[PDB]
Design a protein around this ligand. Structure first.
Ligand SMILES: COc1cc2nc(NC3CCN(Cc4ccc(C(N)=O)cc4)CC3)nc(Oc3c(C)cc(C#N)cc3C)c2cc1OC
Ligand SMILES: [Mg+2]
Lengths: 414, 556
């Protein structure tokens, strides 16, 4: 790697000026140790006050690891960096990545440190190691090579990455590989018996052609990822409250599915009855419930993924460690629905459960469409921004907004 | 001649598409011209400036001012036009250390690097823009033109380039002497340590022997201050710290200049004086823009002002930080969205205090405010001390457990313990999960005409109980809340309520205990008196019995 790739920003856009948020002493000392080694390795260099740009940085610990990792929030820089069509006009996402059985996620982010960065773009990667209590000025750095978490890093290295993957693509033709940011998604249709040895075949294969976190592979199983269709209760005795929640659920589902009727189910609530009173189902109302039950068995008609529009992810807290979510581009047109349960390491911490849920949904969104959705988080802004970095474990960061009004749709996704 | 290490210049460029300033020189008096030529003659022989020819097209107006008793003129180059055209820089002097995070440092020596401020050179490719012309006597000879060779006083990039150049020089000294701390601010260096003074001065002389390698004459500060240092509005003593004397005046006609006076002083005093309020004084700050009108004082603001005066009688001092002890923060509720906290390591001696103001909204509760106060103190503690402190909160563990498990949002509070300090934060009401057996079921609804604002609200129950109330000057959303209040008012201790108002559900599901709407507050007061309340929602206009009967009675 000698020649640099001329990287530019979008027309009429200056570099990022994002303020560094406060960091604990353990994270500051960890970043100083990391950046000192990266400075000796030529990956980063000190900068002067003529560089006014900045990008936030913080330290995390990878899943099942005991060493701190330097994570950069390049969200503002990535949206200011130009679209990378310098080689390909746009790679359609591999649809076979979500139909495989066992998908392994590696971290080829360290391989980006072998390719230098355009000297005219290094000033835009500036970051600051903050000091405690403003005792000293923050330690200022900039990247000399391709940094992890930057949009242009996999695009620039895409020319050199394919040359390393060709001897293995020739070996196995029916294996799907996909790269997104600092992660390479490797999926195969064979069982886990040889999957560990097949991924191990790819571990040292990358090192000999050019790594702290390249020894672990996050395993996925998208062939068994369950979906959550609309389900109606099957009861032998229905109270007034049960029928009220039923029609309320069918009225909500009527906006998604055509032909849903609640007329015969309303004629049973005739009169002012107590909520706990059992109402016997008439055969005319049982037919309407059976008709609506068969309508919900079919998928939603007229749904489609548009690569031009953004993806939206809503999350509802259901309690007892259960979180439901929906991904869509248009309202009432869900592209994928799901439900998690038993968040490991977080039984009394909703924030850690929600944080891990955001990571899992974004991971699923990478396999299906190849991009990240904008989250609608059921949490106050001040609480989320204070603690989400403490439980974050991925190299990428999506966008999110906050929901302050309790949604009524929570009762139906439960 | 002893060789000196050159200070590396910082490459400075103008803003893209912009050129240097070309401002005409002001016609000055004969007495000012003679003074400016005499000082620029001295500045030129010291290497600070240098003469140029007529090739430089840029110019910056130079002035001459004089003090009160000092019968000496002084130049003042107005780089206002150049600062508009100079690139933006990275300011490393935005934040200021808080004394509560500074540890004990007995030995202290403050140096003056004033002569080093004008020794840092300027980028040579940029010196042509700092052109200024001294007018000649009677405008009969060409004006003498100079350009700055060093960082000029008043330029945009001068403070940031100086501190960056000073930090770069102090890095090897501050690394090989870990028992020495050095704080940079303006042309002053604050050096402290915990060693005995015998070792301190020797390391001070070592610092003087380190800065002279770049040719920086740094002696002791003239007229060294007394023990109580006056540093950024603080009084810094060896074992304690406090704020400079801040006392509020006794007036009877307060205007808008006194508006930023009381709030400015009380907020700056809340960091060490506990129990300080300012909300009743700040509620008079809604829409006043000018700085001359008078505002009458409400007795709620006068009582709040008098409460803080009693706290500002005797001065309160704070202790310095000790990393070997734990960090503890206790919070107390003061009333109407007012919260105060104390941060300490050993009891009865606080590192600092503070207050949190309720985020203004339509509906709120004490658990949200306490949660928001915890996140505020958490972020502040990471700034000053770099760690989250253990909290002492006036809320039961069972109360918090019931709150976060049933709250629709995700919420979290770091490690905390309950402290019995009234008033305590408590859940005033909890809605039921399932319908109540044996409780009367109230089917409520409301409606209002959008033109005449005439509305109705009421309920129908399974026991035959009914009510419809005509309303004047109301809305659809207001009649829906009115019907809820009527059902709670006319029901027993246990009640099931059936409504179709999504607006009313969103308010009640937010679990507020206080609101700016009097009608919602009446509903909350009704919910507290109850034993069990189940609120159920149904879609409107869907033939639901009890819901459509009460719908036609309010729709007129
Ligand atoms: C761990 O890093 C640091 C720790 C610092 N600690 C402290 N702690 C201070 C030390 C001074 N004392 C009063 C006193 C104490 C005894 C005496 C005496 N016996 O003559 C006089 C005054 C108050 C407390 N001051 C730092 O920087 C200063 C700041 C921020 C302001 C001033 C002023 N004006 C002076 C200094 C030295 C620190 C800087 C650090 O890093 C850059
Ligand atoms: Mg109605």
């Amino acid at each position: 790697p000698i020649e640099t790739v001329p990287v530019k920003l979008k027309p009429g856009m200056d570099g990022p000026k994002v303020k560094q948020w406060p960091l604990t002493e353990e994270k500051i000392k960890a970043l100083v140790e990391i950046c000192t080694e990266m400075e000796k390795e030529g990956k980063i260099s000190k900068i002067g006050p003529e560089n006014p740009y900045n990008t936030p940085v913080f330290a995390i610990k990878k899943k099942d690891s005991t060493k701190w990792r330097k994570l950069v929030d390049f969200r503002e820089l990535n949206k200011r960096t130009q679209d990378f069509w310098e080689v390909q006009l746009g790679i359609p996402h591999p649809a076979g990545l979500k139909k495989k059985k066992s998908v392994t996620v590696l971290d080829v982010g360290d391989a980006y440190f072998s390719v230098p960065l355009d000297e005219d773009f290094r000033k835009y990667t500036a970051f600051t190691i903050p000091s405690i209590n403003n005792e000293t000025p923050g330690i200022r750095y900039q990247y000399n090579v391709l940094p992890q978490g930057w949009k242009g890093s996999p695009a620039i290295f895409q020319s050199s990455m394919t040359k390393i993957l060709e001897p293995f693509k020739k070996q196995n033709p029916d294996i799907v590989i996909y790269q997104y940011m600092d992660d390479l998604y490797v999926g195969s249709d064979l069982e886990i018996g040889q999957h560990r040895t097949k991924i191990e075949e790819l571990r040292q294969h990358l090192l000999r052609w050019g790594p702290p976190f390249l020894w672990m592979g996050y395993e996925l199983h998208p062939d068994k990822w369950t979906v959550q269709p609309i389900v109606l209760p099957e009861k032998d005795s229905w109270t007034v409250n049960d029928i009220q929640k039923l029609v309320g659920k069918l009225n909500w589902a009527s906006q998604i599915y055509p032909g849903i009727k609640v007329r015969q189910l309303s004629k049973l609530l005739r009169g002012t009855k107590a909520l706990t009173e059992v109402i016997p189902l008439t055969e005319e109302a049982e037919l309407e419930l059976a008709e609506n039950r068969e309508i919900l068995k079919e998928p939603v008609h007229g749904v489609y993924y548009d690569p031009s529009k953004d993806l939206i992810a809503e999350i509802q807290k259901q309690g007892q460690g259960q979180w439901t979510y929906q991904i869509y581009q248009e309202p009432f047109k869900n592209l994928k629905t799901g439900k998690y349960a038993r968040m490991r390491g977080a039984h009394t911490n909703d924030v850690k459960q929600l944080t891990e849920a955001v990571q899992k949904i974004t991971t699923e969104s990478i396999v299906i469409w190849g991009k990240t959705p904008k989250f609608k988080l059921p949490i106050q802004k001040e609480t989320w921004e204070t603690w989400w970095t403490e439980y974050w474990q991925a190299t990428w960061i999506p966008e999110w907004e906050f929901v302050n009004t309790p949604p009524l749709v929570k009762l139906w996704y439960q | 001649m002893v060789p000196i290490s050159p200070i590396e210049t910082v490459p400075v460029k103008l803003k893209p598409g912009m050129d240097g300033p070309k401002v005409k020189q002001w016609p000055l008096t004969e007495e000012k011209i003679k003074a400016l030529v005499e000082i620029c003659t001295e500045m030129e022989k010291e290497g600070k400036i240098s003469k140029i020819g007529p090739e430089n097209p840029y110019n910056t107006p130079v002035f001459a001012i004089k003090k009160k008793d000092s019968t000496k003129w002084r130049k003042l180059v107005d780089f206002r036009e150049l600062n508009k055209r100079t690139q933006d820089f990275w300011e490393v002097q935005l934040g200021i250390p808080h004394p509560a995070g500074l540890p004990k440092n007995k030995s202290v020596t403050i140096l003056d690097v004033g002569d080093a401020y004008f020794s840092v050179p300027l980028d040579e490719d940029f010196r042509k823009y700092t052109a200024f012309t001294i007018p000649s006597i009677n405008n009969e000879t060409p004006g003498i033109r100079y350009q700055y060779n060093v960082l000029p006083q008043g330029w945009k990039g001068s403070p940031a380039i100086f501190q960056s150049s000073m930090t770069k020089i102090l890095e090897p000294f501050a690394a090989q002497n870990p028992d020495i701390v050095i704080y940079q601010y303006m042309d002053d260096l604050y050096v402290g340590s915990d060693l005995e003074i015998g070792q301190h001065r020797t390391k001070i002389e070592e610092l003087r022997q380190h800065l002279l390698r770049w040719g920086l004459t740094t002696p002791d500060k003239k007229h060294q201050k007394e023990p109580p240092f006056l540093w950024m509005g603080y009084e810094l003593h060896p074992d304690k710290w406090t704020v400079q004397p801040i006392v509020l005046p006794e007036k009877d006609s307060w205007t808008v200049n006194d508006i930023q006076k009381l709030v400015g002083k009380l907020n700056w005093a809340s960091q060490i004086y506990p129990g300080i309020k300012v909300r009743q004084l700040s509620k008079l700050l809604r829409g006043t823009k000018a700085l001359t009108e008078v505002i009458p004082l409400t007795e709620e603001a006068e009582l709040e002002l008098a409460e803080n005066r009693e706290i500002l009688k005797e001065p309160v001092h704070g202790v310095y930080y000790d990393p070997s002890k734990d960090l503890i923060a206790e919070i107390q509720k003061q009333g109407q969205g007012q919260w105060t906290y104390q941060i300490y390591q050993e009891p009865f001696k606080n590192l600092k205090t503070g207050k949190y103001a309720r985020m203004r909204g339509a509906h709120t509760n004490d658990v949200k405010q306490l949660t928001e106060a915890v996140q505020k103190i958490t972020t502040e503690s990471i700034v000053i001390w770099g760690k989250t402190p253990k909290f002492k909160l006036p809320i039961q563990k069972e109360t918090w457990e019931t709150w976060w498990t049933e709250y629709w949002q995700a919420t979290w509070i770091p490690e905390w313990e309950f402290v019995n300090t009234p008033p305590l934060v408590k859940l005033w009401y909890q809605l039921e999960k399932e319908p109540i057996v044996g409780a009367e079921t109230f089917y409520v609804d409301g409606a209002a005409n959008r033109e005449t604002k005439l509305g109705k609200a009421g309920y129908v129950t399974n026991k035959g109980r009914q009510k419809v109330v005509p309303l004047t000057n109301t809305t659809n959303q207001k009649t829906e809340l009115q019907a809820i209040y009527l059902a709670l008012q006319d029901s027993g201790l246990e009640v099931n309520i059936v409504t179709d108002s999504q607006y009313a559900l969103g308010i009640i599901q937010a679990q507020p205990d206080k609101s700016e709407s009097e009608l919602v507050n009446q509903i909350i007061e009704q919910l507290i008196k109850k034993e069990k309340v189940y609120l159920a929602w149904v879609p409107a206009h869907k033939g639901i019995g009890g819901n459509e009967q009460v719908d036609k009675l309010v729709s007129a």
